[PDB]
Scaffold this motif. Sequence first.
Motif, PDB file in Angstrom:
ATOM      1  N   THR A   1       0.795  -1.220   0.000  1.00  0.00           N
ATOM      2  CA  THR A   1       0.000   0.000   0.000  1.00  0.00           C
ATOM      3  C   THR A   1       0.832   1.277   0.000  1.00  0.00           C
ATOM      4  OG1 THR A   1      -0.149   0.083   2.421  1.00  0.00           O
ATOM      5  CG2 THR A   1      -1.818  -1.196   1.263  1.00  0.00           C
ATOM      6  N   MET A   2       2.153   1.184   0.138  1.00  0.00           N
ATOM      7  CA  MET A   2       2.965   2.356   0.449  1.00  0.00           C
ATOM      8  C   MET A   2       3.203   3.236  -0.768  1.00  0.00           C
ATOM      9  SD  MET A   2       6.359   2.457   2.884  1.00  0.00           S
ATOM     10  CE  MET A   2       6.987   4.039   3.419  1.00  0.00           C
TER      11      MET A   2
ATOM     12  N   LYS B   1      -6.320   1.212   1.652  1.00  0.00           N
ATOM     13  CA  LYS B   1      -4.907   1.524   1.499  1.00  0.00           C
ATOM     14  C   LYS B   1      -4.264   1.843   2.845  1.00  0.00           C
ATOM     15  CE  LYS B   1      -1.951   4.114  -1.792  1.00  0.00           C
ATOM     16  NZ  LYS B   1      -0.920   4.780  -0.953  1.00  0.00           N
TER      17      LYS B   1
ATOM     18  N   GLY C   1      -2.548   1.252   6.343  1.00  0.00           N
ATOM     19  CA  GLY C   1      -1.662   0.210   6.846  1.00  0.00           C
ATOM     20  C   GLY C   1      -2.134  -0.417   8.144  1.00  0.00           C
TER      21      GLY C   1
ATOM     22  N   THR D   1       1.850   2.535   7.730  1.00  0.00           N
ATOM     23  CA  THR D   1       2.556   1.650   6.808  1.00  0.00           C
ATOM     24  C   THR D   1       4.067   1.814   6.957  1.00  0.00           C
ATOM     25  OG1 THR D   1       0.739   1.584   5.206  1.00  0.00           O
ATOM     26  CG2 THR D   1       2.911   1.090   4.397  1.00  0.00           C
TER      27      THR D   1
HETATM   28  K   LIG Z   1      -0.476   2.887   2.819  1.00  0.00           K
END
Ligand SMILES: [K+]
Lengths: 87, 527, 527
Positions: free
Chosen positions: C30-31, C51, C53, C90
């Motif tokens: 997701t980063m 999205k 974390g 994240t």
């Molecule tokens: K993320």
Amino acid sequence: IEIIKRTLKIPAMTIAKNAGVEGSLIVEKIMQSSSEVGYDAMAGDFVNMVEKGIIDPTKVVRTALLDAAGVASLLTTAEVVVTEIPK
Amino acid sequence: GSAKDVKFGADARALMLQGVDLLADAVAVTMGPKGRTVIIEQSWGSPKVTKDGVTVAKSIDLKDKYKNIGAKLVQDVANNTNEEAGDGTTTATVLARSIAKEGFEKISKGANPVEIRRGVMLAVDAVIAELKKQSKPVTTPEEIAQVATISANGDKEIGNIISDAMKKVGRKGVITVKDGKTLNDELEIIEGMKFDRGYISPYFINTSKGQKCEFQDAYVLLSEKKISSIQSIVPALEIANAHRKPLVIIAEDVDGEALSTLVLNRLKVGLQVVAVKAPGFGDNRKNQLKDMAIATGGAVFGEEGLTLNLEDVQPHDLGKVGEVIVTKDDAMLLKGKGDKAQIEKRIQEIIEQLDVTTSEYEKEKLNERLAKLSDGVAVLKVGGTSDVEVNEKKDRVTDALNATRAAVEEGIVLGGGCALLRCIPALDSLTPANEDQKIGIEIIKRTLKIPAMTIAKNAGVEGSLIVEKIMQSSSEVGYDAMAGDFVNMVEKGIIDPTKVVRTALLDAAGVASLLTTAEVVVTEIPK
Amino acid sequence: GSAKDVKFGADARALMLQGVDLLADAVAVTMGPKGRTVIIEQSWGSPKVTKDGVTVAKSIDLKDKYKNIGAKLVQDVANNTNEEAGDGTTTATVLARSIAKEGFEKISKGANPVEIRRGVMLAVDAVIAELKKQSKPVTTPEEIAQVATISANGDKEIGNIISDAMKKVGRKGVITVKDGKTLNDELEIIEGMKFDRGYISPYFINTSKGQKCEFQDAYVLLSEKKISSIQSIVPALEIANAHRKPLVIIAEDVDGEALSTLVLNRLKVGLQVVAVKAPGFGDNRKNQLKDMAIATGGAVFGEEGLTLNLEDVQPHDLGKVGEVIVTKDDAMLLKGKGDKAQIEKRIQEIIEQLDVTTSEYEKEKLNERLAKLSDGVAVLKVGGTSDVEVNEKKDRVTDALNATRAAVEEGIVLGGGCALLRCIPALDSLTPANEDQKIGIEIIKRTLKIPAMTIAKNAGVEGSLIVEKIMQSSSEVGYDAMAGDFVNMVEKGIIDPTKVVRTALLDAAGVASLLTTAEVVVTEIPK
Ligand SMILES: [K+]
Ligand SMILES: Nc1ncnc2c1ncn2[C@@H]1O[C@H](COP(=O)(O)OP(=O)(O)OP(=O)(O)O)[C@@H](O)[C@H]1O
Ligand SMILES: Nc1ncnc2c1ncn2[C@@H]1O[C@H](COP(=O)(O)OP(=O)(O)OP(=O)(O)O)[C@@H](O)[C@H]1O
Ligand SMILES: [K+]
Ligand SMILES: [Mg+2]
Ligand SMILES: [Mg+2]
């Protein structure tokens, strides 16, 4: 007769389908075109086939059609199938 | 808490696509005039036969949880389309499946799926703008009948009966659909003010032939509180008896001493009187009683605000009706002698109340009051031999009523998926900001062919050839899949509501382009 | 009492690292601006797309209890980062996985993991000090929009609407995020004092066009107790009637005799009066009532302390408003004629009340009162076609709001993981006390490259090359992973809140360096 008439489109459809385009559209445009015109599937263009040298032996085409039609139209007469029990 | 299984990338996406494909394959067989039905097992009794896409979608859940995630997302597409527009759910499902499959196909290491989704939604905004430019407002009842006929799978009788209902109660009028007990459909028009409360005692019957109380040129006494005492009912009866006119008492309840007085004066001397309960449960009952007061020209007694009492009644405080019919289960007031300005003012008040309510249940009561004041209501009784046939037909009747309302609201476009097919040049002129947005635009451009291909494929012809011939044709020409011919679509009446088409495309694109951004899927370990 | 399995040393640590690795691998996709989403099955309905974390971390539990211990610890990292910063979860996850893997790699027979942890924490303190020297205070609304845009995954419209809301209600103003019913986002600014109590009876409606009561230059009567008696409400109406001014009665409840009097004077003679319930439940209700009294310049009646009575009312004890709008569900007071010094004194009192309490629920009420008195509140309604899209977008809106508040509090640093990359020379200058602390310092020094590497790796380029070229460049230069270019990071607006970066690093290092001290793991036998 109608089975054969439908079957006659299959080679051109299959060649176009392997080339990643929609085969029925290609075959329809070929049939709408003048008799010297076909689909260069390698180039993706509609071309005069003889001038581009995209040609087949007559014997190969007639042999493939006759050999396919004989066996497959015999296969379609079947009502019963007898097989051995697997051991 | 619960133990989870996690999969990544292409395997996860393939499983989700298998779920999406299974649901969409079940739904897509229903599409178009040569669509077929789906039979859904019911746990309690007879199975359900349906041509409705959202009904098929909501009935399918899969054991594999990765497949079930995709199935649930396309269920969300179908349900959202049904809730917004009431039709087009099958179209929305096949568009969503196309967008998901194309988006999953385009995911590589360098691809940016979120930016692809941005491209998808930009393309969809362009298509919706083109659809609004394509749209034409409904003007004639013939177009109403055509929209309803198309949405009812070609049933011209359903289109005719919906068009007749809209002629009689208005294009914005209250039209309800219910079970019929016969073989054929019938339309009933309820005029005036009819409510579901009959006589209180059976002794008020004067016409034995229908077991009903019929009066002409009757006074109307309206009571917001119950009438159970002698003094609260004597002077109204004295006014009625002195003026030699029949009296209808609509109250919360007439019981006890007042009821015995009413029955005794009815039987012995022959006093023309009938007593009816006031319909509604709560504030709606008070509102309905005030509407009756305004329609008849009378006053409401026993109210909280003004505190008018039944002991002090004047002849001007009583409404006047030209006709009243009271049966065992319902009462009906015809040609009340109210003031037209009062009635218009109450109607405008109801309209302004409709403009500030979003409950979706009080709006129904407000609309029903508006219709009782203005034009009456329409009831479509759906005929059939068995319950399964009646339910199947009722689905289509409801679809046609929703489609006709949407066509009244936002206009019509060409049917057969041709509306979306004529929006492809509006995507050819777009300039993508980057490669990912280009991929998304191309996904939508390919997806725009899917409804016409699916309609043609259900008709047993080769869909891609049909769509190519449509795109090569002049813009008024599309494919009649029922007749198998290329026709002027508007002249043949193969038309769709603009709202349905745009709703189905937007609802499909949103969910499916969000689905195609996924890299990881997490599910619970089955126990 | 339950039977336990006990594992030792390297096998135990390898199993825990497998758990940490699985959770971090799921979170790491997701980063950054080319991060992808994660779909989480929900038991009750539609799956969630995220999205975020911490949302991915909390959804993953593993059957193997040794792996689940590591997964639970990295969940603790992500959750702690979310709780103190509201973003950067994240980043915290990938930092924690890096520290865990590097620490587990360095454990030998002669190694002292507790002293290695001491080294890790010393290095992290040095990095946080370097980050604080790197930081720059936010001065312009353009930087606010840039911070919010970056935190919302590049959505410039979300950054613009958050910047507009912070322009309108202040950088410390109350801004709430809720679901919208449309396709697009919308900012609503609630000015004045608006609360969620409508009119008591519908008879107070004077403007039919919105079904609301609208008065200008109105007296206001505040009652902390209920008004049910006649003599409690008569002299206030006498004052209003003598001064020819409308009256708004805000009380706990107006019912019975007083309510019937209000309605009778409204309907018959046309007295301009409206009655509203007092909002709040408890001490908050009397606090809001006193705030209303101070804003309007009136006095609260029926209170416990001063014991002012509704029977003796003077015109100076009545508040004055320039405008009052009363709808069915809410009431709104505008332009109260109170004393500016009294209002500022009440604001200072609310501020000092905020400075001494730490309940995190009545702090919200105190902030709400502050905003009603000073600047109003802002409501961001998040658009979308489906619930799953709206929830996904609302996660990012909330992330952007948290990041913007953090940037207001503690300033900004370079985004793209470059802030941590420029702290590596601050670790090169450290003198370790022993070999174990040197190992811990080196663990942190290697970990500092992880966020930029992960952002680049998600973007489909080779992360190590990107990080090497960043470290070889001038200090203002970093990698725009969305554009794929090396840019001045502040000029392109790729910036991060300092609080988010330092919180993520501290929260990751503490838990992961504690984890790397482990020699024995005890779990329950699964039944
Ligand atoms: K993320
Ligand atoms: N004779 C026809 N020729 C071509 N297209 C037609 C014809 N009759 C109807 N259609 C089209 O068929 C579509 C309607 O299909 P169908 O009602 O099966 O699905 P839907 O409206 O998407 O979903 P659902 O009714 O299940 O909610 C419309 O696009 C309509 O224009
Ligand atoms: N165009 C860009 N180029 C480089 N880095 C970027 C760019 N846009 C954003 N970033 C960086 O990406 C990081 C934000 O990533 P993301 O928001 O996905 O995760 P997070 O903040 O660690 O956690 P979460 O949002 O899940 O709570 C920040 O370091 C930010 O500076
Ligand atoms: K259908
Ligand atoms: Mg339909
Ligand atoms: Mg973030």
